[PDB]
Design an enzyme around this catalytic site. Structure first.
Site, PDB file in Angstrom:
ATOM      1  N   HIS A 115      -6.370 -53.615 -15.613  1.00  0.00           N
ATOM      2  CA  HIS A 115      -6.184 -52.279 -15.014  1.00  0.00           C
ATOM      3  C   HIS A 115      -7.362 -51.822 -14.148  1.00  0.00           C
ATOM      4  O   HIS A 115      -7.197 -50.930 -13.326  1.00  0.00           O
ATOM      5  CB  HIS A 115      -5.858 -51.239 -16.070  1.00  0.00           C
ATOM      6  CG  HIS A 115      -6.825 -51.214 -17.184  1.00  0.00           C
ATOM      7  ND1 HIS A 115      -7.988 -50.485 -17.138  1.00  0.00           N
ATOM      8  CD2 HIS A 115      -6.839 -51.884 -18.368  1.00  0.00           C
ATOM      9  CE1 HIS A 115      -8.679 -50.701 -18.241  1.00  0.00           C
ATOM     10  NE2 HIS A 115      -8.001 -51.534 -19.008  1.00  0.00           N
ATOM     11  N   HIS A 134     -12.317 -46.520 -10.943  1.00  0.00           N
ATOM     12  CA  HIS A 134     -10.931 -46.174 -10.621  1.00  0.00           C
ATOM     13  C   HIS A 134     -10.875 -45.918  -9.141  1.00  0.00           C
ATOM     14  O   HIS A 134     -11.817 -45.308  -8.587  1.00  0.00           O
ATOM     15  CB  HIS A 134     -10.476 -44.898 -11.392  1.00  0.00           C
ATOM     16  CG  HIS A 134     -10.738 -44.960 -12.865  1.00  0.00           C
ATOM     17  ND1 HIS A 134      -9.761 -45.301 -13.775  1.00  0.00           N
ATOM     18  CD2 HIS A 134     -11.883 -44.805 -13.567  1.00  0.00           C
ATOM     19  CE1 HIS A 134     -10.282 -45.291 -14.999  1.00  0.00           C
ATOM     20  NE2 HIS A 134     -11.583 -45.027 -14.894  1.00  0.00           N
ATOM     21  N   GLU A 147     -10.504 -39.705 -10.627  1.00  0.00           N
ATOM     22  CA  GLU A 147      -9.831 -39.131 -11.808  1.00  0.00           C
ATOM     23  C   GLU A 147     -10.191 -37.652 -11.920  1.00  0.00           C
ATOM     24  O   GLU A 147      -9.335 -36.792 -11.818  1.00  0.00           O
ATOM     25  CB  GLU A 147     -10.266 -39.883 -13.054  1.00  0.00           C
ATOM     26  CG  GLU A 147      -9.821 -41.354 -13.003  1.00  0.00           C
ATOM     27  CD  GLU A 147      -9.574 -41.973 -14.334  1.00  0.00           C
ATOM     28  OE1 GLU A 147     -10.529 -42.045 -15.162  1.00  0.00           O
ATOM     29  OE2 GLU A 147      -8.434 -42.425 -14.557  1.00  0.00           O
ATOM     30  N   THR A 171      -9.888 -41.860 -20.532  1.00  0.00           N
ATOM     31  CA  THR A 171      -8.845 -41.580 -19.549  1.00  0.00           C
ATOM     32  C   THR A 171      -7.765 -42.643 -19.479  1.00  0.00           C
ATOM     33  O   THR A 171      -6.845 -42.541 -18.654  1.00  0.00           O
ATOM     34  CB  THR A 171      -9.406 -41.386 -18.147  1.00  0.00           C
ATOM     35  OG1 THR A 171      -9.912 -42.633 -17.693  1.00  0.00           O
ATOM     36  CG2 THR A 171     -10.495 -40.307 -18.098  1.00  0.00           C
ATOM     37  N   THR A 172      -7.857 -43.672 -20.333  1.00  0.00           N
ATOM     38  CA  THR A 172      -6.771 -44.642 -20.540  1.00  0.00           C
ATOM     39  C   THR A 172      -6.421 -44.654 -22.011  1.00  0.00           C
ATOM     40  O   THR A 172      -7.234 -44.252 -22.845  1.00  0.00           O
ATOM     41  CB  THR A 172      -7.156 -46.071 -20.164  1.00  0.00           C
ATOM     42  OG1 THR A 172      -8.160 -46.577 -21.052  1.00  0.00           O
ATOM     43  CG2 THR A 172      -7.726 -46.118 -18.768  1.00  0.00           C
TER      44      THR A 172
END
Ligand code: WZB
Ligand code: ZN
Length: 258
Positions: A62, A94, A104, A196-197
């Site tokens: 990811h 990210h 994010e 955040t995941t």
């Protein structure tokens, strides 16, 4: 059918496997600069990365992560809102498919092209897996990226990405100095939040730097050549691996600066 960032397994689906997704201290959030309040009680922040020992870079399916030796106090974050000492375990990013999105956290609803997370765990809990079960177990230092001039200290990362194109690939990544990824100012906003995941655990003191770093269009284009898929699977470009802003609920964002 595992979690990810696609239409059928993305952030709006995560709550089914991870009900804490709808919890009281989820991240990221929008940072409303006018509402954040300066807190003169904050102690000075301390980023001590001179003895950092990077080991490896990994495409985790990811994002990609650069991992550190965290078996000793070698690269630590202290001060600021934090009590005690937090050890650097890894950093990752990210990013978006286009320069207008990818971060994010947002700042007055502004999205940056990408966001760097330097992940640290509280040494009083002994290991990372125990730390994530504690409300003050992690401290994540967040740094925004905008597209402009190149970041010289990022280039060694971008040039190894070809070697970890697909999920599960790793490469030796020693002697990398994360100080080269910091902006000039350590002014920050801080609030209590979460990973955040998935597993979305509510264990993070977030420290988000006000000053973005600039990276070149070529640098970010190389992030967007990575793959979410494994080798020999259909190519799915690793882009838009960010979770959108979550409800602030009963939290205050504090500023270290006036
Ligand atoms: C120790 C609990 C645990 C945490 C994490 C993972 C696996 C984990 O183990 S488990 N058993 O749930 O699969 C893999 C996904 C990881 C997460 C720790 C927090 C991570 C580093 C995230 O950092 S972040 N964005 O700063 O919140 C992104 C990837 C996350
Ligand atoms: Zn992250």
């Amino acid at each position: 059918h595992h979690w990810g960032y696609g239409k059928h397994n993305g952030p709006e689906h995560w709550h089914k496997d991870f009900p804490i997704a709808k919890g009281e201290r989820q991240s990221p959030v929008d940072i409303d600069t006018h509402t954040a309040k300066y807190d003169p009680s904050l102690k000075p922040l301390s980023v001590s990365y001179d003895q950092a020992t990077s080991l490896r870079i990994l495409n985790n399916g990811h994002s990609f992560q650069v991992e550190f030796d965290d078996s000793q106090d070698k690269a630590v974050l202290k001060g600021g809102p934090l009590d005690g000492t937090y050890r650097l375990i890894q950093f990752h990013f990210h990013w978006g498919s286009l320069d207008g999105q990818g971060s994010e956290h947002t700042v007055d609803k502004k999205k940056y092209a990408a966001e760097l997370h330097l992940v640290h765990w509280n040494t009083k809990y002994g290991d990372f897996g125990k730390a994530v079960q504690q409300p003050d177990g992690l401290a994540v230092l967040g740094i925004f990226l905008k597209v402009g001039s190149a970041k010289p200290g990022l280039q060694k990362v971008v040039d190894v990405l070809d070697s970890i194109k697909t999920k599960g690939k790793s490469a030796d990544f020693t002697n990398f100095d994360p100080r080269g990824l910091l902006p000039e100012s350590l002014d920050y906003w801080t609030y209590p939040g979460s990973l955040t995941t998935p597993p979305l655990l509510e264990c993070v003191t977030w420290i988000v730097l006000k000053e973005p770093i600039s990276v070149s269009s070529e640098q970010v284009l190389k992030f967007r050549k990575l793959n979410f898929n494994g080798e020999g699977e259909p190519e799915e470009l690793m882009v838009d691996n960010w979770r959108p802003a979550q409800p602030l609920k009963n939290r205050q964002i504090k500023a270290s600066f006036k």
